Amino acid sequence: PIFLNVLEAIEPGVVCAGHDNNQPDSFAALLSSLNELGERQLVHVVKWAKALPGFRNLHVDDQMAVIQYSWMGLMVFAMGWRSFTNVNSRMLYFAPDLVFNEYRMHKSRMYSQCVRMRHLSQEFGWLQITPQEFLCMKALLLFSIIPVDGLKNQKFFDELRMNYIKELDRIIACKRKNPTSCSRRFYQLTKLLDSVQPIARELHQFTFDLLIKSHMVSVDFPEMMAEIISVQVPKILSGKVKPIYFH
Numbered sequence: 001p002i003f004l005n006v007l008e009a010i011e012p013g014v015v016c017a018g019h020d021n022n023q024p025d026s027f028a029a030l031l032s033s034l035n036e037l038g039e040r041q042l043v044h045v046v047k048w049a050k051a052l053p054g055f056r057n058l059h060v061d062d063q064m065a066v067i068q069y070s071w072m073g074l075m076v077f078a079m080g081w082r083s084f085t086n087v088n089s090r091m092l093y094f095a096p097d098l099v100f101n102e103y104r105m106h107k108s109r110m111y112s113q114c115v116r117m118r119h120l121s122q123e124f125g126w127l128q129i130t131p132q133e134f135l136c137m138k139a140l141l142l143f144s145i146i147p148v149d150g151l152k153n154q155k156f157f158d159e160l161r162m163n164y165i166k167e168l169d170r171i172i173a174c175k176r177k178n179p180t181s182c183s184r185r186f187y188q189l190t191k192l193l194d195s196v197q198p199i200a201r202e203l204h205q206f207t208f209d210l211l212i213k214s215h216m217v218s219v220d221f222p223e224m225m226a227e228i229i230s231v232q233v234p235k236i237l238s239g240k241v242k243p244i245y246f247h
């Protein structure tokens with residue numbers, strides 16, 4: 001289980017938002033902490049992605065771009081798993097110090113998106129996603145959104161993605177002799193993985209609008225995150241960069 005030993009070994013630990021929870025909830029503070037949190041997680045997504053088998057093969061420029069494009073989707077997936085294992089989908093476990101109840105979902109003005117992520121969180125339980133299927137699906141998520149104009153070296157990316165899909169195949173085949181059994185499972189996971197994209201899109205849209213009017217709502221965007229949003233998010237929303245759906 002060399003591949004899975006690696007995925008487990010590099011899985012990031014707990015990341016806290018640094019949110020002041022004894023302060024009454026406000027849009028400005030919740031979002032400022034979500035932005036800070038988002039940034040704190042990116043630091044781990046980068047160290048995590050670079051330690052992934054074969055990731056180093058990608059061209060240095062594709063590595064960064066791929067991490068940036070899939071940044072939202074990867075967080076969504078990991079947050080839903082956290083919400084499932086930690087609180088049973090009762091709330092959204094963004095971080096230990098940033099747990100969202102419906103009231104917070106509403107105040108953040110990302111209610112539609114939150115309810116969708118809560119549903120994703122319930123899927124982990126309904127589908128009985130094992131900790132290993134989770135790890136392999138998350139890795140595959142990093143290789144699921146590319147530029148229509150192509151990466152600097154599109155071929156290496158294609159090979160890499162195909163190998164991650166093959167690993168998922170193995171995890172599914174592990175303890176499933178019936179081919180029909182493996183098929184139904186692949187269908188379910190690929191379907192669950194696609195469902196992450198529409199959520200990421202809505203979150204991307206929300207983040208884009210929020211940045212443009214950041215100054216009017218007193219939200220504080222980290223210097224690094226603002227730059228990445230202004231350069232990368234529009235490519236996604238305008239259709240230049242698109243996610244790879246299975247279905």
Ligand SMILES: CC(=O)Nc1ccc(OC[C@](C)(O)C(=O)Nc2ccc([N+](=O)[O-])c(C(F)(F)F)c2)cc1
Pocket residue numbers: 031034035036037038041068069071072074075076077078079080094095203207225228229230232233
């Ligand atoms: C390409 C790009 O700019 N991506 C990107 C930019 C900003 C960004 O953060 C936006 C915001 C509003 O701070 C946010 O959604 N933060 C955030 C922080 C943590 C988590 N999380 O799961 O731990 C999430 C998530 F995934 F739930 F929506 C979202 C996320 C992705």
